[PDB]
Design a protein around this ligand. Structure first.
Ligand SMILES: O=C(O)C1=C(c2ccc3cnccc3c2)CCC1
Length: 166
């Protein structure tokens, strides 16, 4: 959990303009959060990048979880192996507001982070899920009470987040 170059936003939320895959390889955190979908099909965005960094080991494992347990619900999570990126991967489903999923479930999605003392994570429901990433940061800040180190890939997005927060 050797995080470096993070800007402290609140007592428990830190942010960095970084590739979450590279942060996971450097830090080897106890928990890396995946911005997952209900079937754990890691086809793009952070999910695609984390799965690609495990050479598809995350996807094989996720398919077996789904065969045995069925899909997650929107706002829910499951803990699986972190493979070579972390001890554990907490897969969390935020709402896809572009598919009419309720934004109220973004709070429920972030509540899953509270079962873990320290996490390396992306912002939830950003990108293709369609939520406003600055709103997603506000929900994170209001909801997460454990220590969360957020990695943001896009410098343009990172600068907008840091400008709006501090
Ligand atoms: O910074 C992020 O968490 C976001 C995105 C993203 C996309 C593609 C990535 C590819 N490799 C690593 C991280 C990536 C993150 C898209 C929406 C917000």
């Amino acid at each position: 959990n050797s995080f470096s170059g993070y800007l402290k936003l609140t007592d428990n939320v830190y942010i960095k303009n970084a590739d979450i895959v590279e942060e996971a390889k450097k830090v080897k955190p106890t928990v890396v959060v995946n911005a997952a979908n209900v079937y754990l099909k890691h086809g793009g965005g952070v999910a695609g990048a984390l799965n690609k960094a495990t050479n598809n080991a995350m996807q094989v494992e996720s398919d077996d979880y789904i065969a045995t347990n069925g899909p997650l619900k929107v706002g829910g999570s499951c803990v699986l192996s972190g493979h070579n990126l972390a001890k554990h991967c907490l897969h969390v489903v935020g709402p896809n507001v572009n598919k009419g999923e309720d934004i109220q479930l973004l709070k429920s999605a972030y509540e899953n982070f509270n079962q873990h003392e320290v996490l390396l994570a992306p912002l939830l429901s950003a990108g293709i899920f369609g939520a406003d990433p600055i709103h997603s940061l506000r929900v994170c800040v209001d909801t997460v009470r454990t220590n969360v180190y957020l990695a943001v890939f896009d410098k343009n997005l990172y600068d907008k987040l840091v400008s709006s927060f501090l």
